[PDB]
Amino acid sequence: CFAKGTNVLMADGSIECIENIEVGNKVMGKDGRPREVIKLPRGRETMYSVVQKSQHRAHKSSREVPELLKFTCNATHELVVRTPRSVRRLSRTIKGVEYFEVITFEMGQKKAPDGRIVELVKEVSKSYPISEGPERANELVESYRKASNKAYFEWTIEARDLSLLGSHVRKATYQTYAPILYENDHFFDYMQKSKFHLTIEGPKVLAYLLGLWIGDGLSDRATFSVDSRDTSLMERVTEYAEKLNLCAEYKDRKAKTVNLYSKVVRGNGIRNNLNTENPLWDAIVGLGFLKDGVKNIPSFLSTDNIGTRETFLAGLIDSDGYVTDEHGIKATIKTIHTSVRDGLVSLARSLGLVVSVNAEPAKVDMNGTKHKISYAIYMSGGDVLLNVLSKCAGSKKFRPAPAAAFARECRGFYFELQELKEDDYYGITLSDDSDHQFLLANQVVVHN
DNA sequence: CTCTATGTCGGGTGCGGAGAAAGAGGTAATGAAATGG
DNA sequence: GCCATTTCATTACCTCTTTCTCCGCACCCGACATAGA
Numbered sequence A: 001c002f003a004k005g006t007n008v009l010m011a012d013g014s015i016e017c018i019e020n021i022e023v024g025n026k027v028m029g030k031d032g033r034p035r036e037v038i039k040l041p042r043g044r045e046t047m048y049s050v051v052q053k054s055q056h057r058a059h060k061s062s063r064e065v066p067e068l069l070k071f072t073c074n075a076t077h078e079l080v081v082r083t084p085r086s087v088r089r090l091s092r093t094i095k096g097v098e099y100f101e102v103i104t105f106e107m108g109q110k111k112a113p114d115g116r117i118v119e120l121v122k123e124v125s126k127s128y129p130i131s132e133g134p135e136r137a138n139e140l141v142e143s144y145r146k147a148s149n150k151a152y153f154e155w156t157i158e159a160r161d162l163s164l165l166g167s168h169v170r171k172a173t174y175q176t177y178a179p180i181l182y183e184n185d186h187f188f189d190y191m192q193k194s195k196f197h198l199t200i201e202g203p204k205v206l207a208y209l210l211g212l213w214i215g216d217g218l219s220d221r222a223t224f225s226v227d228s229r230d231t232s233l234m235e236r237v238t239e240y241a242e243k244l245n246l247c248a249e250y251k252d253r254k255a256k257t258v259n260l261y262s263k264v265v266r267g268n269g270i271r272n273n274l275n276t277e278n279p280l281w282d283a284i285v286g287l288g289f290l291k292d293g294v295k296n297i298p299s300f301l302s303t304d305n306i307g308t309r310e311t312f313l314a315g316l317i318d319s320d321g322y323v324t325d326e327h328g329i330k331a332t333i334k335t336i337h338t339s340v341r342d343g344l345v346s347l348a349r350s351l352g353l354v355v356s357v358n359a360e361p362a363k364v365d366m367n368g369t370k371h372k373i374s375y376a377i378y379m380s381g382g383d384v385l386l387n388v389l390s391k392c393a394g395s396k397k398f399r400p401a402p403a404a405a406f407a408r409e410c411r412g413f414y415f416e417l418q419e420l421k422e423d424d425y426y427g428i429t430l431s432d433d434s435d436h437q438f439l440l441a442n443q444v445v446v447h448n
Numbered sequence B: 001c002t003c004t005a006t007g008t009c010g011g012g013t014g015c016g017g018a019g020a021a022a023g024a025g026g027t028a029a030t031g032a033a034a035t036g037g
Numbered sequence C: 001g002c003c004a005t006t007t008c009a010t011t012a013c014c015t016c017t018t019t020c021t022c023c024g025c026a027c028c029c030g031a032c033a034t035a036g037a
Helices: A135-145 A159-164 A167-171 A186-192 A202-216 A231-243 A279-288 A306-320 A338-351 A383-389
Strands: A007-009 A015-017 A026-028 A034-039 A042-045 A047-052 A070-074 A078-084 A087-093 A098-111 A117-124 A127-129 A156-158 A174-177 A221-226 A246-248 A256-262 A322-324 A330-335 A354-356 A374-380 A411-419 A423-426 A437-439 A445-447
Touching (some): A007 A437, A026 A437, A047 A159, A078 A445, A098 A135, A117 A167, A156 A159, A174 A445, A186 A202, A186 A279, A221 A231, A231 A246, A231 A256, A306 A383, A330 A383, A338 A354
Antiparallel strands (some): A026 A034, A078 A174, A087 A098, A098 A117, A098 A127, A330 A374
């Protein structure tokens, strides 16, 4: 059961407030498929607060508080958790004799003060004196390592039982969120829904261009900047631009500025068109990449076609995107516009990538200039991210496409738990044969 | 003549990148107190 | 209670990311003029 306010992800990918979800509607299953609701358990109880942990620190100005994943449930809500399997060996001495130890995480049981019989994870140790010889020990260690396939346990525990966990286990316990595997085709239907009728590279190229525009584009013309130096990118531009059937008006004249002109009438002389008869623009406005005068990453994109979701970032990254590879594939977009920040994060995750932003306060300096609140949104995620990069043109950005059928597994997150005051709670119940867990809106995986 | 799309101009500031710090969980290593026979 | 493990939170580091931050000038954006319409 959830505290009132908590937003849910509906199977159609919309977002509905928990208190308003009725019976018969279909929530989002971690598999992207629908999870029907059959009961609206309501009531009053003691509520608990959740909130991811993180290397974040700047406080204690109103420097915005992070976008940390969070939610609030009653004391008996089941937390879909995970805990690593761990086995360490150790040699210690007491009462004279020194022995061998075999510390391990194994799921046992423990008595809740309230009397209940709770199934959880416990730290277990088995030991005998060094006299016998490290042989017995070394045996179990593998007889464990070689016990189960998954490197972690996947169980459930009620907020109110969490304390029951020992120190070591507690710390080594996290919750997870899953990627938005569902898929609308709003992008596609839109494309088909218009006058212009292009090839089957549209959704792709168009997507890629919208990506670049957002990053290095101009906010009042279907034109944008480029690094006179990245040639590969340069071509991509022409190519994709050409496929949408438009022109690349390259002008590096004292970095490079281009303009994507329609092949329409030119006007009387040469004073070509760029915004007119241009799908790019027809969309920027159509799909909402330009809300109320400022750029923006439209939310519908978080729930649309993955390919397209990918390609778009591809574009964003090819302009305003710095990539490295030294200790893992990672990419960093920098912005100053909230909408851009947000919209991007919500999208970034939809894929399964790990995201974290870092604001930089306004400033004013020696040049006496007034800087602005800046955001350095950070991403990573092995394959998932790679498969995006594989769709890049930039030299320093491009990266080969993952093996294949790379799994879009859930990402876990360490959190904090807080005891709140009793309060009305709303919960929903799914049909039996399902997994009994649905995804929230901030992509966090929860049980009903 | 008025109302929009295209070039195009000048000023103040977005962001580019990298290196480093500051957290966060994992490990041993302890000190001892609880369990079962 | 003697024995012989176990259980457990805390301690001092230990590894690994991911949050921060630094700063000037080439470039981004608002401002303006002018071919269309």
